[PDB]
Write a protein that binds this ligand. Structure first.
Ligand SMILES: Nc1nc2c(ncn2[C@@H]2O[C@H](COP(=O)(O)OP(=O)(O)O)[C@@H](O)[C@H]2O)c(=O)[nH]1
Length: 324
């Protein structure tokens, strides 16, 4: 392999008494707007390069799953109010009150057969479903349908959160987070605030109504064009491709990019965006952008993508990576 050959030509470890035992280091900065997948990528490195999340570990995310599920339904229900959507059947209006009763009597997340029923009944409602369907009009968790559609499982008294349940979580993170993991004998120090940068973009934020997509481009623009990053490999993750795919079906790219004239198909719309971002590169002859369409919650896609991102690093940056 080319990266194999590429690695094989280094001679620096011969300069270290016991160099074949040294740690070659890769410093990787993870960037992108809020809620764009940075934390999910951090979790996936654990899942893929460590063990990630043990059932004991997943057990700790139970009240986070409950918490996320409760918030999601409450957000759709409160929205119907502002948007004026009726309940498909007005008996549901009582479950709506009960949701606030049960949620209102608690500090932290929980699930009860009673709460489980109220939420299921509401979720199955057509009017609620109609409001759900207008999610671009209000703030709603991306994992909402994920969690809501799997309530019973989640509702089970002896429920243990799966790795996917854990990856689907929205957890409030503050501070810099630093993860160390080894892959292909490279020791990565990854910082979710430099050898490479992975910039995440939530593709589905396009129809959300400055514009979200445009604030991300705004930031990408500055990032890749920064002098500090001149020798850093700029990787662009056009993430949430899974939510974008279903969304582009009924929503139009023009909501985001009004001048867009291509077909509103996943192919043309996603291609358009990639072009929009890479177009920001002010040194196109000097710098290349490595774009990947990702689903951060899909461990296989990330494994795939990361393997690829990794070979680019070896081929472009190994020489600047120090031995420790
Ligand atoms: N379906 C889907 N959800 C995702 C994707 N990446 C992140 N999420 C969900 O979006 C939410 C926010 O992602 P997170 O990593 O916390 O974003 P950060 O704020 O950039 O760290 C979490 O619930 C994720 O599980 C993706 O590609 N697809």
């Amino acid at each position: 392999d080319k990266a194999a050959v590429e690695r094989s030509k280094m001679i620096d470890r011969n300069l270290r008494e016991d160099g074949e035992k040294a740690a070659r280091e890769v410093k990787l900065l993870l960037l992108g707007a809020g809620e764009s997948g940075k934390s999910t990528i951090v979790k996936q490195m654990k899942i893929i390069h460590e063990a990630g999340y043990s059932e004991e570990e997943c057990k700790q995310y139970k009240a986070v799953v409950y918490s996320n599920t409760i918030q999601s339904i409450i957000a759709i229900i409160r929205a119907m109010g502002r948007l004026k959507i009726d309940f498909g059947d007005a008996a549901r209006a009582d479950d709506a009150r009960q949701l606030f009763v049960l949620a209102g009597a608690a500090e932290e997340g929980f699930m009860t057969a009673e709460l489980a029923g109220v939420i299921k009944r509401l979720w199955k409602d057509s009017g609620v479903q109609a409001c759900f369907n207008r999610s671009r009009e209000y703030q709603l968790n991306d994992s909402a349908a994920y969690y809501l559609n799997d309530l019973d499982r989640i509702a089970q008294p002896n429920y243990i959160p799966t790795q996917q349940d854990v990856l689907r979580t929205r957890v409030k993170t503050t501070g810099i987070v630093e993860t160390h993991f080894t892959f292909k004998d490279l020791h990565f120090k990854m910082f979710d605030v430099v050898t490479a940068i992975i910039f995440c973009v939530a593709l589905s934020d396009y129809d959300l109504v400055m514009n979200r997509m445009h604030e991300s481009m705004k930031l990408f623009d500055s990032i890749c064009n920064n002098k500090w990053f001149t020798d850093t490999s700029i990787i662009l993750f056009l993430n949430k491709k899974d939510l974008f795919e279903e969304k582009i079906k009924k929503s139009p790219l023009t909501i985001c990019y009004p001048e867009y004239a291509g077909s509103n198909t996943y192919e043309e719309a996603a291609a358009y965006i990639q072009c929009q971002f890479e177009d920001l590169n002010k040194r196109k002859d000097t710098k290349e952008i490595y774009t990947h369409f990702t689903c951060a919650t899909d461990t296989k896609n990330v494994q795939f993508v990361f393997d690829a991102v990794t070979d680019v690093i070896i081929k472009n940056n190994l020489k600047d990576c120090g031995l420790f």
